[PDB]
Amino acid sequence: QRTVARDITLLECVGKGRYGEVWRGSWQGENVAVKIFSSRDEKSWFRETELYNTVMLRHENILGFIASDMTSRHSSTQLWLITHYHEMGSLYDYLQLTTLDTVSCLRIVLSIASGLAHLHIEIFGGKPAIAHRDLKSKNILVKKNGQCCIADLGLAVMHNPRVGTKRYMAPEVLDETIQVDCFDSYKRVDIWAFGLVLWEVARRMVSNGIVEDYKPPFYDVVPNDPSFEDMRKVVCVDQQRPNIPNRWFSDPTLTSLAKLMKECWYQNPSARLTALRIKKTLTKID
Amino acid sequence: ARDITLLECVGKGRYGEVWRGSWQGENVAVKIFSSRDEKSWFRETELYNTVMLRHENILGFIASDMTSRHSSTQLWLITHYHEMGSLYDYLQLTTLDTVSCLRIVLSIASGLAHLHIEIFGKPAIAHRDLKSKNILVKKNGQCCIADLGLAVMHSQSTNQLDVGNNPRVGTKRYMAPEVLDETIQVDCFDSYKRVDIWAFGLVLWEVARRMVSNGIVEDYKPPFYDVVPNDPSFEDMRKVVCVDQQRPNIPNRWFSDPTLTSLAKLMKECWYQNPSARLTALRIKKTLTKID
Ligand SMILES: COc1cc(-c2cncc(-c3ccc(C4CCN(C)CC4)cc3)c2C)cc(OC)c1OC
Ligand SMILES: COc1cc(-c2cncc(-c3ccc(C4CCN(C)CC4)cc3)c2C)cc(OC)c1OC
Ligand SMILES: COc1cc(-c2cncc(-c3ccc(C4CCN(C)CC4)cc3)c2C)cc(OC)c1OC
Ligand SMILES: COc1cc(-c2cncc(-c3ccc(C4CCN(C)CC4)cc3)c2C)cc(OC)c1OC
């Protein structure tokens, strides 16, 4: 009976961090992405694996699962997550060099909204509702067809000493008022972070020969690797929001996207738009 | 060298399938879980993450995998392969002398005490499905405990109890009275250790029946063979254990043999209806270390 070919050739390291490493790998002639977890971040492997063991997500705007592997070593456990490989890399990577036109900007943001609404929605029969809890431009990959997909469900909750990336934390997370037993609270945290990503992308959309340089959200008001307190003072105490440049108000697409961002950034989480309402609004732009 | 050849199916049931396979020139066991038992696969994976679980009397772990394309998911556990099979298989076809009987039961006590005792690491672990089909026989005549899919973990360091999320229940024939009457104290780690001790007592009985004394041995029988239907229901077991207060009978021939007299005493102290009266795994290991 059958050969189970499990060998993956690790070809190129495409990410190194506290989480561990991501490699471009080869399996049976095909590219795969291999995330090798640090000891420090084993709980992210467990949570993503538990989720995929609960529901095998399959969606064009969700990074495609291939496998979770645990391998015993002499004195340690090796944990790999294997997924589809997107050679263009992360949206963060892509926006550094590339500028966008109206069609590519909308395609990027509507594909993200699509992936996020798919996470958020409970389907009966189906999938539980899922909140991501660490949405940001480094956790979004660019596909060759110009749509994106959402990655990293290591913090996801279904209806870990890891917490979300501080720069993208909603005000209720920073002021510890989040209603932690209400699933909808976690959806509203993702909408906040989505609005920051929408801002990051919109800056790189050209209008009337103008574009902004790539900057991360709050680049002008917090340090690199901002503290929790740094973020709380900006977002909660002073209630700052990312700048909308004047030049956007000459462009109908960027004018509509500015309005959309605003409705992701209400202090009151329950006032924020839903991912489904963001999709509809994006489908009516242009 | 990661690839695996599946050579022979050694078992198919509700648990899924187990294959004898070849890996880096060695026999390995490859369990493919039924899609209905996915919570067991995940729990066994959480347990085998613990480097200090490793023990001569615990089934040795190689790898765990979840694989998927489209809507199809496979769940794999890859372990050491024990070609002598389970203790259940072994006892069908062989009788034991004193030395072999004690080697087998002390090895199982050794495994179980290793599970139950926290290492300050490895959490304290209660198995919850101990039975002769979940014990493998090794060529050195010791055994190893398998199938951690129902395990409960506790750390007294942090006062944390992890009962997991598995709808699966233990094998009905081996369920303790408090499991069968559903009065078990579910937020008490000691409750689950006591359930393991009950099932250990039943395994001791199965083994001891196969040890020869004075030219006599009993035929292999599973616990409660005489008092329940074939393929007993939960309620069948509850009737005999809880309502009828039945315990496996001690053959009178055991009482002329010192070893079987000692083992009968040990079984009885695993079988109290009061869970708190039952011996600990460490006490059983110590008692079996002193018996000959
Ligand atoms: C264990 O580990 C890894 C395995 C694999 C892999 C390699 N070839 C074939 C397979 C395969 C898929 C599915 C079936 C089905 C066939 C139909 N039947 C009714 C149910 C079972 C059999 C075999 C797999 C899953 C890849 C891996 O990584 C790329 C693995 O490591 C993570
Ligand atoms: C966020 O999360 C995960 C992401 C990925 C992932 C999937 N496709 C492609 C990539 C990638 C490829 C290539 C570049 C660069 C490298 C330099 N030069 C060649 C330009 C391009 C960057 C990024 C990644 C990092 C996999 C993951 O797990 C397996 C992730 O974790 C869930
Ligand atoms: C993990 O990932 C990959 C796996 C595979 C792969 C390898 N062998 C066998 C299979 C397979 C065959 C048949 C069934 C089904 C068919 C219908 N019914 C009868 C139930 C059983 C399932 C699975 C697969 C899917 C290939 C892949 O890529 C080409 C994979 O992706 C990288
Ligand atoms: C219980 O649990 C697990 C067990 C195993 C495992 C490991 N070595 C050997 C075996 C075995 C081999 C052969 C027979 C023979 C005996 C009699 N003959 C007439 C038919 C068949 C029985 C048993 C098994 C079943 C692997 C597992 O995971 C990979 C298990 O799950 C944790």
Of B41, B266, B96, B267, nearest in space to A52 by CA: B41
Technique of determination: X-ray
**From A66, which residue of chain B is nearest by alpha-carbon distance?**
B68
The number of the ligand 3 atom at minimal distance from the alpha carbon of B68 is: 1
**From B67, which residue of chain A is nearest by alpha-carbon distance?**
A67
Q: Which domain holds residue A68?
A: 1-87
Question: Is residue A218 located within the same domain as residue A229?
Answer: yes
Contacts of A84 in chain B (CB under 8 A): none
Ligand 2 contacts (CB < 6 A) are A 14-15, 22, 33-35, 81, 83, 85-86, 89-90, 93, 139, 141, 151-152
Question: Is residue B133 located within the same domain as residue B75?
Answer: no
Of A226, A157, A165, nearest in space to A196 by CA: A165
Question: Is residue A142 located within the same domain as residue A78?
Answer: no
SS3 A134: coil
C-alpha–C-alpha distance, residues B24 and B37, integer Å = 29
Residue A199 C-beta-side C-alpha neighbours within 13 Å: 23
Declared resolution, Å: 1.4
- CA angle B182/B131/B103 to nearest 5° reads 135
Question: Is residue B45 located within the same domain as residue B145?
Answer: no
Instruction: Look at the block and give the residue holding tokens 């002021």.
Output: A175
CB of B92 closer than 8 Å to CB of B159: no
Question: Is residue B67 located within the same domain as residue B131?
Answer: no
C-alpha–C-alpha distance, residues B147 and B128, integer Å = 10
Closest ligand, as measured to the CA of B17: 4
Residue A160 β-bridge partners: none
C-alpha–C-alpha distance, residues B275 and B286, integer Å = 20
Closest ligand, as measured to the CA of B3: 1
Residue A192 C-beta-side C-alpha neighbours within 13 Å: 30
Question: Is residue A118 located within the same domain as residue A219?
Answer: yes
> Both tokens of residue B9?
């199916």
Question: Is residue B166 located within the same domain as residue B29?
Answer: no
Question: Is residue B107 located within the same domain as residue B1?
Answer: no
CB of B71 within 6 A of ligand 3: the answer is no
Residue B216 C-beta-side C-alpha neighbours within 13 Å: 11
End residue of a domain, out of A34, A57, A87:
A87
Report CA(B23)–ligand 1 centroid distance (Å): 15
CB of B235 closer than 8 Å to CB of B290: no
Of A119, A108, A147, A112, nearest in space to A57 by CA: A119
Question: Is residue A251 located within the same domain as residue A163?
Answer: yes
> Both tokens of residue B5?
């050849």
Report CA(B71)–ligand 3 centroid distance (Å): 10
End residue of a domain, out of A55, A87, A119:
A87
C-alpha–C-alpha distance, residues A241 and A228, integer Å = 16
Query: Domain tally for chain B?
Result: 2
CB of B58 closer than 8 Å to CB of B134: no
Of A176, A104, A162, A92, nearest in space to A134 by CA: A162
Per-residue DSSP letter, A74: S
How many DSSP H helices and E strands does chain B contain? 8, 10
End residue of a domain, out of A87, A120, A143:
A87
A53 reaches B (C-beta below 8 A): yes
Question: Is residue B229 located within the same domain as residue B156?
Answer: yes
Tell me which residues of A are annotated as active site. 134
> Both tokens of residue A166?
């501080």
Question: Is residue A74 located within the same domain as residue A94?
Answer: no
